[PDB]
Design a protein around this ligand. Structure first.
Ligand SMILES: *[C@@H]1O[C@H](CO)[C@@H](O)[C@H](O)[C@H]1NC(C)=O
Ligand SMILES: *[C@@H]1O[C@H](CO)[C@@H](O)[C@H](O)[C@H]1NC(C)=O
Ligand SMILES: [Mg+2]
Ligand SMILES: [Mg+2]
Ligand SMILES: [Mg+2]
Ligand SMILES: [Mg+2]
Ligand SMILES: [Zn+2]
Ligand SMILES: [Zn+2]
Ligand SMILES: [Zn+2]
Ligand SMILES: [Zn+2]
Lengths: 479, 479
């Protein structure tokens, strides 16, 4: 459809004039950041951002591409180079070391320099690198970790953990020789390495000993406790703190967040990762936006400010399944959380960065008309005389042959939440992609995020802006 | 391979410190731009940029991803939204109207508002929108158009032409009813609409009457003149100017560019589009970098400054063929031309923008090791037990079935210049993609290119910066 307002040049000339005046109005900060927030859309490359913008605009009553996402209103943008030291297409662990610790690492390791080697416990010590969240804590700030995946998953773990193997969620995953050598599982590192004021997401099962029934799924033994050492890490965390609370459902999270006297909050909403937003039980589980508001209610009480990590973690999972509906709906909730955090914090004293750890081999093609659904068929038939979708993958589990040929697809099929877009190469899981991802910034020192930069820049500008990490001697005025 | 220097955190901490100091050193321009250059990588989306950076670094003796492209050193970056008014995944013509005229249009039309309709000659008049190159000419600047495609192809045509059908290269392409109604073919509009000081690229055949032998291929009749009206448009162009020269090969281009007394130069190097750089005859044809230096030698003589369009036009073609080797080598020469132009102009008085008109469904995946060739196989076999490449397409002509199954691929095969990467859907030509593309800027007012902007912003910031278009009353000091 062609909207009549856009047929007149003046529509476009007035828009661009407004754009110019807005651009001329921005000026850089001479002041420090009191608060730091990093919003991490896992797997949210440029193709993800544009497809999610279109979907979100159509959910409003619009055509799509013209309606800005919340992240699109951030004034400063840069491109970020993701390669890990050893591999050109990276994983979450080693990217986490770059954007949270400011050092690049080897694929599937977390919080370690590239002198460490994957799955080699004896190459850990002497290679630990410290996150900017650890440093904000050393400076007296309150610190929070919010995600839709397990809180021991790779991205959140980069804020507090140091490990040669991202798969060591609990001690049951760690080989006996590594346990003997002292390589602690990630759930142990979550309660032990540093003090974290707010911990919210999935991963209840790695905190309790084998045999402990899950509170939400007591009739499903596979959702129970995994530990081999008999420990209850939630209770050990709770015991070192006055005013600490543990929550496992939405109603207790929200009540706890309204209670001064709480001060420390661990909220573990599912045994493993949280449900995709389209499968969320809204009586039992908090959305990503609700977790981020809950975390901000607590974190904002500290007069010295806070550090907050907020992850749209299952964007990535949707792409691995080659189910763009799942990846795009998770991206819209992630943008909704960014908007919410923006309403609860001031850009005068809060540096907010939105980025992705890496991308996916996800593409938006064909030549669909303005206003058409993003999960639709491309206009016209392919060379094998069958329909094809505007959304596709390079590789992944949507590759299918039926009697030696590519299957035809209907519009009713292609718009289903379980639909897997086709790919050129069959893989159990679609792969990450190595192209640069965007960085969106606002707040004190956000104008330093510019151009084309290594992914370690994200960590370094946050520390500089709050005058942490190796940057006290920042030349900044108070927030 | 893991480079030993990168195993030490200090490598990364020193790099980021340097990055911060550089970022702190930039300050905006209070002055106008004397010169304007727009570098247009046709089809050069973010995935193209990163794969081309890796290839270019490996051509030097490096690992790849760490080595900056010339475009990567531009201080200011933004994301650009490409949709056309009527279609979410755009074409070159209507994107050209947005980035050269500052108004969005309908797919496959050029220089017209969206009140015009594709292939409907009777919807042209009253809908013409003027380019910033036309306005720089009205202000007394010298103007140049340089490209590797036909100079009548969609992108260059956006600087001077107004048409409901980008396919009307010569009068032979225009239906008789449209000729009668006055819709002039693009080759006629090139010499007639406005005065252009330098015209360099392909498209010799549309300038001469049917029967005229091509100078470079006199023994191939299909490369000869196409016109139905008996005109010789090169001679008609040459006749209105004192000091105009026509050239068809490299040696005469370069000599003409060294001669004051020349002043107007039309250089048409191939009948249709120019050869890909890997097929270029270096005695007969100038590279993209040589055309841009030749154009700058002439354009720079004017004391009032110049406008210059420089297109890496066959990047796009390489992607349509699903031959990433062709798309990436054309991208490296395009970056080489950007570097060259940077050496021949000052950022103190020249606003330079690098962008793409849109992207392609091209992806860089698998999990290849650091330093591995970009045209290589991904580590490990796919679910059908056969190898797969790191580079793939969503759709396009690389889809193949041999006896009902996806073909295996060897490293010798995948590194060939004719190799077509596999795709999920067979199409004669791979499709454009609709995701946002990058904008890179340097020079006076370049700091106004920021954030997430509509593609019309490119045109509008150039006019503002040189105080043209609807922006005299710019509040800028002289360059
Ligand atoms: C770690 O143990 C393995 C297996 O015994 C051994 O090969 C390697 O050399 C050890 N490395 C260090 C860092 O001591
Ligand atoms: C252009 O001509 C076609 C064919 O006769 C006609 O249908 C259309 O209405 C005409 N349009 C204008 C703009 O007059
Ligand atoms: Mg993650
Ligand atoms: Mg739950
Ligand atoms: Mg072009
Ligand atoms: Mg030639
Ligand atoms: Zn990830
Ligand atoms: Zn992933
Ligand atoms: Zn194009
Ligand atoms: Zn194209």
């Amino acid at each position: 459809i062609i909207p009549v307002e856009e047929e007149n040049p003046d529509f476009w000339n007035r828009e661009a004039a407004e754009a110019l005046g807005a651009a001329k109005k921005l000026q850089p900060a001479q002041t420090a950041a009191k608060n730091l927030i990093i919003f991490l859309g896992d797997g949210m490359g440029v193709s993800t951002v544009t497809a999610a913008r279109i979907l979100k605009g159509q959910k409003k009553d619009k055509l799509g591409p013209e309606i800005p996402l919340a992240m699109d209103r951030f004034p400063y943008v840069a491109l970020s180079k993701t390669y890990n030291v050893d591999k050109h297409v990276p994983d979450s662990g080693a990217t986490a070391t770059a954007y949270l610790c400011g050092v690049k690492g080897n694929f599937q390791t977390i919080g370690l320099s590239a002198a460490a080697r994957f799955n080699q416990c004896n190459t850990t010590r002497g290679n630990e690198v410290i996150s900017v969240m650890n440093r904000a804590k050393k400076a007296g700030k309150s610190v929070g970790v919010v995600t839709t995946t397990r809180v021991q998953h790779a991205s959140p773990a980069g804020t507090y953990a140091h490990t040669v193997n991202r798969n060591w969620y609990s001690d049951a995953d760690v080989p006996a020789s590594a346990r003997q050598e002292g390589c602690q599982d990630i759930a142990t590192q979550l309660i032990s390495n540093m003090d974290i004021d707010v911990i919210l997401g999935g991963g209840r099962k790695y905190m309790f000993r084998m045999g402990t029934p899950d509170p939400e799924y007591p009739d499903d033994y596979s959702q129970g406790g995994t530990r081999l050492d008999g420990k209850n890490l939630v209770q050990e965390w709770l015991a070192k703190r006055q005013g600490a609370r543990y929550v496992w459902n939405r109603t207790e999270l929200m009540q706890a967040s309204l209670d001064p006297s709480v001060t420390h909050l661990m909220g573990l909403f599912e045994p493993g990762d949280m449900k995709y937003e389209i499968h969320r039980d809204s009586t039992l589980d908090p959305s990503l936006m609700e977790m981020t508001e809950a975390a901000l209610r607590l974190l904002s009480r500290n007069p010295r400010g806070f550090f907050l990590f907020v992850e749209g973690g299952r964007i990535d999972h949707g792409h691995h399944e080659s189910r763009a509906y799942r990846a795009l709906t998770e991206t819209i909730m992630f943008d909704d959380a960014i908007e919410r955090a923006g309403q609860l914090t001031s850009e005068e004293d809060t540096l907010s960065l939105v980025t992705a750890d890496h991308s996916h081999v996800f593409s938006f093609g064909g030549y669909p008309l303005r206003g058409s659904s993003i999960f639709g068929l491309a206009p016209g038939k392919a060379r094998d005389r069958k329909a094809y979708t505007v959304l596709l993958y390079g590789n992944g589990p949507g590759y299918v042959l039926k009697d030696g040929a590519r299957p035809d697809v209907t519009e009713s099929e292609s718009g289903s939440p379980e639909y897997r877009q086709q790919s050129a190469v069959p893989l159990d899981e679609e792969t990450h992609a190595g192209e640069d991802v965007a960085v969106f910034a606002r707040g004190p020192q956000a104008h330093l995020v510019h151009g084309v930069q290594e992914q370690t820049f994200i960590a370094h500008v946050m520390a500089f802006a709050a005058c942490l990490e190796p940057y006290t001697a920042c030349d900044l005025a108070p927030p």
